Scaffold this active site. Structure first.
Site, PDB file in Angstrom:
ATOM      1  N   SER A  45      -3.246  16.838  -2.427  1.00 33.29           N
ATOM      2  CA  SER A  45      -2.117  15.936  -1.368  1.00 33.29           C
ATOM      3  C   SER A  45      -0.976  16.014  -2.197  1.00 33.29           C
ATOM      4  CB  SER A  45      -2.760  14.833  -1.151  1.00 33.29           C
ATOM      5  OG  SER A  45      -3.636  14.981  -0.031  1.00 33.29           O
ATOM      6  N   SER A 105      -0.738  10.149   3.468  1.00 31.38           N
ATOM      7  CA  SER A 105      -1.686  11.177   3.292  1.00 31.38           C
ATOM      8  C   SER A 105      -2.316  11.909   4.173  1.00 31.38           C
ATOM      9  CB  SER A 105      -2.482  11.119   1.716  1.00 31.38           C
ATOM     10  OG  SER A 105      -2.638  12.208   1.029  1.00 31.38           O
ATOM     11  N   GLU A 141      -5.420  22.304   5.213  1.00 35.67           N
ATOM     12  CA  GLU A 141      -6.126  21.260   4.893  1.00 35.67           C
ATOM     13  C   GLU A 141      -7.386  21.227   5.764  1.00 35.67           C
ATOM     14  OE1 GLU A 141      -6.161  18.867   2.911  1.00 35.67           O
ATOM     15  OE2 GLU A 141      -4.006  18.195   2.273  1.00 35.67           O
ATOM     16  N   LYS A 209       3.360  10.440  -5.300  1.00 47.66           N
ATOM     17  CA  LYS A 209       2.490  10.899  -4.428  1.00 47.66           C
ATOM     18  C   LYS A 209       1.071  11.177  -5.083  1.00 47.66           C
ATOM     19  CE  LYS A 209       0.757  12.481  -0.469  1.00 47.66           C
ATOM     20  NZ  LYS A 209      -0.495  11.832  -0.889  1.00 47.66           N
ATOM     21  N   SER A 210       0.078  10.645  -4.765  1.00 47.40           N
ATOM     22  CA  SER A 210      -1.081  10.892  -5.317  1.00 47.40           C
ATOM     23  C   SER A 210      -2.068  11.908  -4.652  1.00 47.40           C
ATOM     24  CB  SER A 210      -2.104   9.656  -5.345  1.00 47.40           C
ATOM     25  OG  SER A 210      -2.373   9.090  -3.909  1.00 47.40           O
ATOM     26  N   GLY A 211      -3.253  12.501  -5.218  1.00 46.78           N
ATOM     27  CA  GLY A 211      -4.181  13.263  -4.269  1.00 46.78           C
ATOM     28  C   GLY A 211      -5.318  13.333  -4.981  1.00 46.78           C
TER      29      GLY A 211
END
EC number: 3.5.2.6
Length: 263
Positions: A45, A105, A141, A209-211
């Site tokens: 993400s 997300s 996605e 921003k994570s993922g």
């Protein structure tokens, strides 16, 4: 600071997996610290920041509108769509879709926006055009999180992602108004609390921003700094661990704590 590299190595020990790390000076672009800076990692993400950068670039050129409304149906919804699943009836605007994609997300938001710009190959072309010949988006996605060992699809390198983010948040590519809109979404993260944010002292800035993905993949990109302003970019990626999400979260936070201690 090399003590931070001690913690990154320890993290690899603890997770039984590769960890990629870079610390980049926002102003000068100088690499301050690195570990596996030119190995490829799944973006997961974190690509969503790049996606909304491409969208904002279209808005700056007049080819898209933040207020434009997008309609979709239940057929479009994929796993982890906490915001888009709520708005099937009236649709959502581009602005709302970028907010959902970056602050929550939301996966369907990302797909819908990818459609608007022409798919993964147009995002890849946008990146190439701004000097990133490494980062590539290939799938939609949620398939882009597969993280097959050695697969180059949907990957980046820590140094590539760090320099691209610097270009987006500080270069002439986007209007100042768009630049700030992007930062604003990333500042308003609602899902990355157990990662860098948990080590961050009072009054510091963070935009992140994570993922997450399969095969123990986990990552975060961030611009952060003391006194309410960003002064460094940090990127951390890991993949291959059999470790639980909590264990992965903890190791990244401990890397954050070390980076902050030796700032």
């Amino acid at each position: 600071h090399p003590e931070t590299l001690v913690k990154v190595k320890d993290a690899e020990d603890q997770l039984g997996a590769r960890v990629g790390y870079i610390e980049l000076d926002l102003n000068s672009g100088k690499i301050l610290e690195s570990f596996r800076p030119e190995e490829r990692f799944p973006m997961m993400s974190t690509f969503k920041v790049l996606l909304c950068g491409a969208v904002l670039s279209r808005i700056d050129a007049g080819q898209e509108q933040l207020g434009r409304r997008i309609h979709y149906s239940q057929n479009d919804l994929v796993e982890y769509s906490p915001v888009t699943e709520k708005h099937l009836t009236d649709g959502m605007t581009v602005r709302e879709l970028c907010s959902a994609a970056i602050t929550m997300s939301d996966n369907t938001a990302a797909n819908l926006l990818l459609t608007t710009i022409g798919g993964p190959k147009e995002l890849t072309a946008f990146l190439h055009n701004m000097g990133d010949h490494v980062t590539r988006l290939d799938r939609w996605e949620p398939e882009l999180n597969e993280a097959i060992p050695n697969d180059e699809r949907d990957t980046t390198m820590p140094v590539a992602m760090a320099t691209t983010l610097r270009k987006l948040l500080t270069g002439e590519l986007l209007t100042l108004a768009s630049r700030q809109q992007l930062i604003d979404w990333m500042e308003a993260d609602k899902v990355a609390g157990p990662l860098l944010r948990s080590a961050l002292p009072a009054g510091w800035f963070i935009a992140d921003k994570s993922g997450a993905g399969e095969r123990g993949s986990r990552g975060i990109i961030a611009a952060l700094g003391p006194d309410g302003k960003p002064s460094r970019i940090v990127v951390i990626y890991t993949t291959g661990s059999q470790a639980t999400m909590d264990e992965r979260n903890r190791q990244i936070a401990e890397i954050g704590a070390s980076l902050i201690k030796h700032w």
